[PDB]
Write a protein that binds this DNA or RNA. Structure first.
Lengths: 95, 106, 78, 92, 78, 95, 102, 92
DNA sequence: CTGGAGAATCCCGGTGCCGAGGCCGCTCAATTGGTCGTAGACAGCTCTAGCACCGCTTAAACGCACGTACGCGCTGTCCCCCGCGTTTTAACCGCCAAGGGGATTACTCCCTAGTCTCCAGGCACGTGTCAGATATATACATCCTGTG
DNA sequence: CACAGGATGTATATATCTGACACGTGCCTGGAGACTAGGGAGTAATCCCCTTGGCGGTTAAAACGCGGGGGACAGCGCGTACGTGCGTTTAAGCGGTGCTAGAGCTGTCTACGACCAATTGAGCGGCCTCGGCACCGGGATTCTCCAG
């Protein structure tokens, strides 16, 4: 049995719009954050709640960006988001 | 003296008039704070809290829950037009998003 | 090379939560660049707050103040 | 150290609007940060109102004008009604 | 019926300054609606500032403050 | 002699992007402002500078919106701005 | 004057008074107005330098709002600082999308 | 009634950076609003910084951190250098 | 176009746990009650500028005709992204251990508010001249069609 | 299919003229100088908590590979609606005159808010404790899809 190309994408859309849990893996994200912070100050420590706040902010930002990117892609009569959709959304936002 | 009565009770308010007054005085807002400004501000804060909590309790009852969670707060805010305008640049942690699939994608 | 730890399935889950149905293969590197720029801005402000407090530990409040300064107020962390 | 919050007043207002509905600690944290955010918005707008008119005092009418500026429409008018009713009750 | 005073040639000039090369005929009503909404927001806030001062005359300062409150700071009018 | 459909449009774009004067007629705009303000308070007077500030702001806003709209129209491989372009621009902006 | 002691053109004393009477804190340190006047003077000098260049680029010798807008929107960091500011009589930048050209 | 502005200071700075260049009244009004706006931004940031750290005083350090928070990159570092130079000279 | 398979999701029910919710000390911040001094309400007056009108000039709006190029629908190709089964990796969870540093307390001092006197920097007001606004005629520079 | 040249538009000296900018004057109010008083904060020591580092086991998830279909995109044709331009209308712009509403200031005076010291109860921290929610499993229902 095979579903056609897009049924399962819609399934994940419905599922992840019902859910609220974070979608990036915590430990890779924490290593990324600490690596990024190395360039500002050495031997820095982080509270766990600071890292969690960063992850919440990052995921909210990316989800809103993907919503705007979807509108830009649909505007060009497509269903596939492309880097140019992201660039247009971020240009309209003023980034 | 007499029986120490709170200004919230005099105003018929649930929010604390004295604490809002002290936060205004030590908040570098003005040199002086009038007597009715904390009463008014507490009434405004109480009204906004009551609106959000009523809509969130409705959202919680719709999911057959007896306890408000961030999801119900987010559903209340994003489903209410004016609350969503007030909180437009705010992220609610663990709130998720509103269910919305563009019709061309179906 | 820890940015590569933000994997392709994670970006797909984020785009699914954003309602996206079909995703170009080039979206993932662009999304990594976007996330790195965002984190750079927020973390620069957070470490500035940390340095002002003369602390050595970035706190959740430093992050929340950084986000609010960038017009991204965040409820649920104090 | 003692950390103040609006949690008790939020719970009383909730028991007014929803007698049996309870609240998790995360939702209460969100409501507290929401109250603080709205306080800062209205107080800053009232502060700059008093400054614009070269006044030293934040009064009920500065708070009312700030509410009409910051709240969207029906929110603003119901909040103004409640605020003036509360000030009337306190003054009497 | 004063919204019609913002004529099609004027909207075309605005679009030209905006860099638009070719304008659909349905753009003009859309632009009149957009401008009406914008002016309603700004003027509502300006009249709120005016009434607070117990004046009957809407002042340039009211308008500047209203523009600033909407995140649209204007320079050149105080 | 006739220019082709778009040459004079580009000439106008260059001309009006070079200049700074206001583009709406002052008396119609003033009547519009007074008519709108009638709905908020009767017998209002206006300073000339208050109307000029309103008009400056309105024209700057409309020009920036038209620039975003032109971007959204180019994204869909058109050269003609349409109400859907304006609406996409205002949606991504958050209006 | 405190401006001469700090080596400034901006009013250290007036800035101090505006800070004290601006409801910013209970107290203002002695170095706060000095630092703030220096930063304000630096940002003013940056904008005025670029705007004088833009005035020269319009064959003008006197700065007008158009020259200020050209200065602000052509410099990247000033455009970031003034991202949501509208300069009256400033116009826009002459930008035509290349897909529209003949 | 007399109305204080920043016009003479902006004009002194203009005659410093471009000895032959002038400025119109409208452009000077724009410059005045720019100075007022930047002042308000930096002072607001210094106020909030002082509040977050439970301080009563706005100092050079609060001002410097506000400048580093509000200005982008090279503008921030150069403004910081100007501020530190002025404070060192003032105390000297 | 139905009609069954097949998969996914949802609905019910039993378990169990841990966090929401109520209660008890307690303390510190809000209330009481006066005092005072100044911020603001109010009345009167001045005079600025906003409103109203009016005649005239002409720039702009409007209405119309014509054609072309752009929007849009349709077709076809192909490749790249989705759905899914399999293998590998390292995230995750639970636990242990060390100690860095956030947070508190006490103390002490120096830096800033407050006051008063005094004066000079800065604001309102005049004024003159030169940079810029406005023709004006011209030299290009550009677009478009005919022609080779 | 590519230049020639003609018509059109725009950039460029050049001359007039004017009004707004730049500088000087008078004066006044707010900024500086010299103190005193007091508390905000700088500093050192200490405590405990919560951050980091390690380790091992389990399994969810990431990575990978493999069809295959469907969506992106390129090409082509057509029709209509917008651009360009032209003649007609109409109210905008401009300049003046005139009138008065109300903005803005000033002088009084009072009542309202800061402040301060004592008191006490409202709210906060801590601490149980039971029931709402998470979880797990299993079956019913709905939805998708392809084969006839």
């Amino acid at each position: 049995h095979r579903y056609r190309p897009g049924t399962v994408a819609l399934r994940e859309i419905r599922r992840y719009q019902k859910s609220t849990e974070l979608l990036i893996r915590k430990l890779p994200f924490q290593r990324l954050v600490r690596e990024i912070a190395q360039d500002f100050k050495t031997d820095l420590r982080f509270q766990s709640s600071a890292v969690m706040a960063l992850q919440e902010a990052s995921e909210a930002y990316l989800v809103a960006l993907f919503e705007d990117t979807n509108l830009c892609a649909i505007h060009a009569k497509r269903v596939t988001i492309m880097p140019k959709d992201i660039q247009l959304a971020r240009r309209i936002r003023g980034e | 003296r007499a029986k120490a009565k709170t200004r919230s009770s005099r105003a018929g308010l649930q929010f604390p008039v004295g604490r809002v007054h002290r936060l205004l005085r030590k908040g570098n807002y003005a040199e002086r704070v009038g007597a009715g400004a904390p009463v008014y501000l507490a009434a405004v804060l109480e009204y906004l809290t009551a609106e959000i909590l009523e809509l969130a309790g409705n959202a919680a009852r719709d999911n057959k829950k007896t306890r408000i969670i961030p999801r119900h707060l987010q559903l209340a805010v994003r489903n209410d037009e004016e609350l969503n305008k007030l909180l437009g640049r705010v992220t609610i942690a663990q709130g998720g998003v509103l269910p919305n699939i563009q019709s061309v994608l179906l | 090379d820890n940015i590569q730890g933000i994997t392709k399935p994670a970006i797909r889950r984020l785009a699914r939560r954003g309602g996206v149905k079909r995703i170009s293969g080039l979206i993932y590197e662009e999304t990594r660049g976007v996330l790195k720029v965002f984190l750079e801005n927020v973390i620069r402000d957070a470490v500035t707050y940390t340095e002002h407090a003369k602390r050595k530990t970035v706190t959740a409040m430093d992050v929340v103040y950084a986000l609010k300064r960038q017009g991204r107020t965040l409820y649920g962390f104090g | 150290t003692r950390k103040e919050s609006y949690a008790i007043y939020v719970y009383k207002v909730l028991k007014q609007v929803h007698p049996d509905t309870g609240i998790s600690s995360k939702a209460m944290s969100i409501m507290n940060s929401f109250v603080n955010d709205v306080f800062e918005r209205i107080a800053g707008e009232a502060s700059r109102l008093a400054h614009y008119n070269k006044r030293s005092t934040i009064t009920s009418r500065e708070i009312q004008t700030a509410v009409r500026l910051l709240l969207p429409g029906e929110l603003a008018k119901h909040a103004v009604s409640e605020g003036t009713k509360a000030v009337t009750k306190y003054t009497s």
